[model samples]
Target: PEAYWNREQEKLNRQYNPILSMNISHLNYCEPDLRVTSVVTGFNNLPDRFKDFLLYLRCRNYSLLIDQPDKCAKKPFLLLAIKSLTPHFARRQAIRESWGQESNAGNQTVVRVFLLGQTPPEDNHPDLSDMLKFESEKHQDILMWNYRDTFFNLSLKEVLFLRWVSTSCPDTEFVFKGDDDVFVNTHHILNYLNSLSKTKAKDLFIGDVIHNAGPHRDKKLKYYIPEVVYSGLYPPYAGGGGFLYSGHLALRLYHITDQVHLYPIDDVYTGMCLQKLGLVPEKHKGFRTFDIEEKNKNNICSYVDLMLVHSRKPQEMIDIWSQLQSAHLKC
Candidate 1:
């Protein structure tokens, strides 16, 4: 007797996640179907940027404009992947000099790479490619893909970075991904990682997690998502300012991302992928994705045991790192 129940359940699953039924390879270079707006009610009323995203949402492959193929050659204990823009030259340099410095702490290798996308000339961005190439050659820490690096393209950046991780740094033990402006206490993070039990370490994912979130509908807002695009509560996700996770999970996430459709908000899309994997991002007291109180900003001890703090300027990052590294400082 052919069981009809399992077949129907599988169909339901595919229907729930339409991307699950999609042929991944077939979407590699397909033309943008203009009829999507007609297919999805109210899609035409959405912002042009949203429409632009929808037209080519299935396209995932992008060539790497700049890459450091040898970064993970030694199988690093941790890879600090900074989400950055081409114009944020100072921010990238400050990070390289400060917390993003590649090192061997606690006898564990730590590697750093800045993830970026090209700013196309159509966007009126001044030519920075020459300087960018110089910086990449000097630091040997840049991984950039050829695409327009806009706010909407951030989720694409996330997916591309995860793909890069699966291919280039599969053996890395842990990954710390954060904005260029955040101050990460590498020493503290490494200490915490070393203390985790083997089981806990394999599944680790933590940061300042936001729970019970959903898409913003207000058209004027930066994160607005039309009801025609999606309708549901979002899974809990860490703020994109900074987050830490296991390398084992990173590889799994690369595969899971294909099952989830790209969301405008990068962090929320990550939450969607995590839900598909039956995993949750744990909230940690150490990460302050939101800025710490102003009173604590200049206090070195405030950051002594913390994993990461958001929104520090370049000079402030240098100052903070210097103070944090002082040998005689007592917290």
Candidate 2:
């Protein structure tokens, strides 16, 4: 047990050395060709109009990520990773325009997007294509990849994508991993990160975690982690809905990927890896990993005070964001 812990500590030091050494500019990894992008969609079969509404709703919230400067500038890069089952052209365009607003120019903050799929759909909407072209012209860093063959499950695909990013994009200072439907107050996130960086705790991994849970051995269930595989009583990393990591931790994780076995549940796998590497996951009261139930309103504010809320509903996101913005204005 001491040997395991010692090995894990060495791994943690190696993984976080970039931050500790203040030499993040040196590490690099193989950049997979943009031949494939992952586009993940949840709850298929909704009417086209509802889909559009969802896109519009999400776009409106996403704009907040761009509009708020205090948050956007906290990290080196602003990347939105999405796994889409269906192509969302208008939504993508809106996101591009929102980020490319004149206020954000020359900030060195660029939005890198990943779309997961095997091939472009047969009925590619012309308007969507036009938007992509327009975005490309303004923000030349826009990236797309299709990884349909390898990543069928949303959870698994995100983990692989994160690994790819950590290895490929060495220059990125911070990584924000989030879901498509969730609304992120990028400003708050950036501000919180900035605060963390100012303190001595910059090397820590931050997020909301599910504590006091054992692995699931139920073979019938889709999401399971065998206790024999990982004997920990609780997971160390935060839930994956949205979490932030320093580029240093990202690089270390990529290096250790081959050493760790691939697990289907992304969060648990992350916890296990962190444990193996001897890094503790720090939970923020603001970081939420549950759905938007009615009773969660008070807790929502509490959670936001620390990091970000997890898995919020569409309308609830709009309401929460609007109220927060209004409160800011009044202050």
Candidate 3:
């Protein structure tokens, strides 16, 4: 009788226990340990950039220098969170006037916000803080944090943005996140979102997914990863140029991010977070993170069906958007 009762108790405990649990309070643990060079194998031989990254590996949260805590107050149907830099005034302006335009389409409200980080004085940047403040006041769409906006710090931007979303924009239904350079077809994305079934919309995450990829080992390449830093094949992740996801999943990813250590590559770090939730980003052909064929690059019809394409200049973005609006064109 005692054995049967013990078996019953174990079953009940199993029912209540969460499948995944962790004491991730250590994620906030940081004191800028310079000893990482000695502790981590091959760390001493790595580039200065990588050495710096390892030194502050555990620090995830950074204070906000500029914020729009009220931006999501109205519970927008879709939020366009475009990552931008302080110096890219032209890109941000072009986006605001074009695809990043905040408006209501077919009864669905779309909101826009640009994510940013500080440019350190040593980077030869002319001070633009006052200019940025003016833009923020006039537009009310900028979210800037206090950190040195470097290539490796992009992951910091990712985590900070997610933290902002969880607190300020928790009610946002969906989000389309991308860089400022990409020309997003806002209408097409809205149409796709509207057509989704409730269940599909709940977990939707789609973009130009890269499968079975690993870090670049070449030391001189832009995405090089050292053996001491990471030594495994990467999980499937969407290209960061642009991607669409549900807010519900974004919240879940935020919590899951605590368990995953921040990776230097922001997009790859995002993929790690998704993997933690046992979710794989779905690949959609419409996303063109790699850009379209060169011959069709300027053709308006070439972009009509694609969800996103990458690396266009500010003027080119405006041109593509205007041409896309022309009624005389036939695809």
Candidate 4:
């Protein structure tokens, strides 16, 4: 089992394939370094009090625990960049069986890449990396980077992913960035994108845009944003539940993040970077960020026209997908 421990540690260091190796102080394992002699991380020499500003660990989005880097090259219309945690295998499975079905959206090619972070042993597979690799081999749709999977680190996932697409899948026409928990109507999304067929994709940053919004200061809340980390009103940003952006904006957003402050909330940090780039997020009526009650979700027409609904259960997502596929509704 001790040998097993070493392998897990090594896997952690290998999260970044191109190696975003920052020379953070390493812990000298008194044992004669049986595994990792040198490991690199961007978060080592930071403060203890976990502040968003403490996220100075910058790296390129060049690594993939499970990668089909060129999967979108032939059909680079719309890519769903799903932010998923490791233990959510069921959720991922449900998505594949749902709206995430490849090329199912109307007149659009939709690709998915589930963004993940490292987690300690959990679920059926204690060796999450090995299981994840197996999943990738089967599905070819997983991207992982080193870093603890916490609420704060969610922003890091966003930062890394923005860079990942900017470099790896730069040609993708649109990116649907959101959490795995949200249900997406790929059909409506494509219709919306098609409507913008005449609009330059570069200027298309559409979602439920949050304008004149500031940090959440309620310390009691999970989303409380401390003033010490980010003071003043937040720049207009799309809700993270799900939003669509063009490839041009992704590259520009990636480029501008070098000197800006890193916030724990990804959607806000996206706005922060866009703020730096002097870009704006547009609102789409179809994009919804509110939680839907079970009774309220039964209206097929209401959902048929909507692009996304946040905080859905995995089974419910699959159910909705089945509903959409089975019934043809005129919105």
Candidate 5:
């Protein structure tokens, strides 16, 4: 009976029309969706007590993401990936390696780190060696890899990791894709996800997305994806701020890699694939993918509210993490 439904659902998904194509330029010019305003208003309208409870839960979840020991008896497994540009590649690699090395000491279900950026110079490649050292030292179970350089090549990286997991790391329970600049509160992600059942969460491909028209024939734009790769509207996937996927969904995506064509932009490509798979891309209100410019005074509250924030500087991450740690210690 389940198989029958799965097959039926697959058919329905294949036949469903995409909500929008994986185009950014067109969406920016399009009028903003009024529904977003309504959703924000609705969220704000919630009672103060409920809002505070939700915020507290969010904070607790963030603590779990970072592997901070808490009184919570049940904890979800964690899988993390951080993409780094050239300038901070070494530090990013070091952080992942260190975590990977110590990943096995506690109740850690799973921990893996990946670097998405240009290949480091051979002389500076000790960063990779450092990762290995940490893994060996801590006797941790994790996978690490570095990809070639390409600006806005997130889509390609996703494809590569899907293929890799499908082939090499078949037993992973969950997969997390994050940014090197941002400090991830894994505990928060896990706790919040734990609040949702596995089946409920499995249906969601969390991300921020902009729905827009198709891209042009020009090859210069970072958003360009060859039509041959995929020829349909994209679903809404979480923005690359950071996204989490259940083991089942991750493997399902890995299996469907061959059917889904690769694109330049990561989020849209995932959305397109999800659209084909009959899975809906659910927006996680907690995800904040943006730059921390000087004008944004509401940044701290926004950061505290999000599941993940993108485009953070190293110093900024440290500062945020410190603040979070201090708060956690108090409780």
Candidate 6:
């Protein structure tokens, strides 16, 4: 019995959402066909959204919201990568002042970057673009591509960022990737990487691993994947909140990237690439997406020791980072 994923996808369209109950015109989309890194010939034959992306892939390829090729020229030991939204100004600042600042950890040269896409017309205004330009001139840490920012296209963001890293910042030992909302102990992450250098340094991917979760068909949930997309159990993958993989493996991901079918779920798509390449992701106790204790768990030192935790605010970053440096207690 062949499963028809699109058949399930169509059920949502006339009812409400093509992907959910939510009204979204930019939501439903075909998986990207990347047999060529550039635009497919006769672009006029393709859908506008998809065709625009393909053309940009051929012409513009990429745009630097900000860059630091000179800084990482000698190959940094660690790269802190984040997928951030354009309007997330405060969040980016919080990261910069906290762990995301261009700095060093132990013997490793640690740097940070934000991956982004253009603000959709509805969300874009002069002020927002002005702010991004302001930040770019100030920090020079953003890597942007010519594509509309949408939930479904986040997969494309990661895929293209991987491609950019292959050439732009190719020489690096480790890459720590996460979102704009998470808190990380940069010291802990780099320390862990250095330790792994003696042993399992290469093929390394670590974070919270969700095993055996299948695609969602429920209309209410945000992660609804129709049958037109993947219908099988998702391969075990690190949650997208915060995770790390070796630099070598990142290049591997970039090279074999065009082969993996694009899926909206960024982490799940990452897992698919890993599956295709026959690499495994390792789990670490230090990486926790859900902090059950809540409110610093009555101790800031524990936060200092943790590699990653979910939903941290700007003030929290300052406090956690401050207390982390000064805290004398332990779990």
**Winner by TM-score between candidate 6 and candidate 3:** 3
- Report the Cα lDDT for residue 226, model 1: 70
Angstrom error of the Cα, residue 79, model 2: value is: 4.1
Scored by TM-score, the top model is 1
Given candidate 5, what's the lDDT at residue 13? 41
Q: Write the per-residue lDDT of candidate 3 for residues 164-248, one digit (tens) a residue.
A: 9999999889999899888888778888888999999999999999999988989889998876676667889998499999999
List candidate 4 stretches off by more than 4 Å.
1-63, 104-107, 121-126, 329-331
Task: Give candidates' CA RMSD values in order.
Answer: 5.0, 12.3, 7.4, 9.9, 16.3, 9.2
Clashes of each: 0, 16, 0, 0, 17, 3
Clashes of 3: 0
What is the per-residue lDDT of model 6 for residues 1-331, given as tens digits with 9 covering 90 to 100? Answer: 1233233234434354345555321233334434423323344543444444432332224455455556567578888889998889899999999878777545568878898888856655435777788888889887777677767677788887887678777888889989999989887887677676545887888899888889888745788754533456888899849889888899999887655545667898798788768877778888879863765465876676689888788888877887787665543
- The 10 consecutive residues of candidate 6 with the worst lDDT sum are 1-10
Ranking by lDDT: 1, 3, 6, 4, 5, 2
Mark the regions of model 2 whose C-alpha exceeds 4 Å error after superposition.
Answer: 1-110, 115-146, 149-160, 163-168, 198-202, 218-222, 225-235, 291-306, 313-323
**In candidate 4, which residue pairs clash?**
none
Which TM-score value belongs to model 5?
0.59
TM-score for candidate 4, residues paired by index = 0.78
Per-residue CA lDDT of model 1 for 211-283, tens digit only, reads 9987788978878777666666689999848999999999999988766766778888788788889999999
- TM-score per candidate, chains pooled: 0.91, 0.57, 0.90, 0.78, 0.59, 0.80
What root-mean-square deviation over C-alphas does model 6 reach? 9.2
The lDDT of model 2 is 0.48
Clashing pairs in 1: none
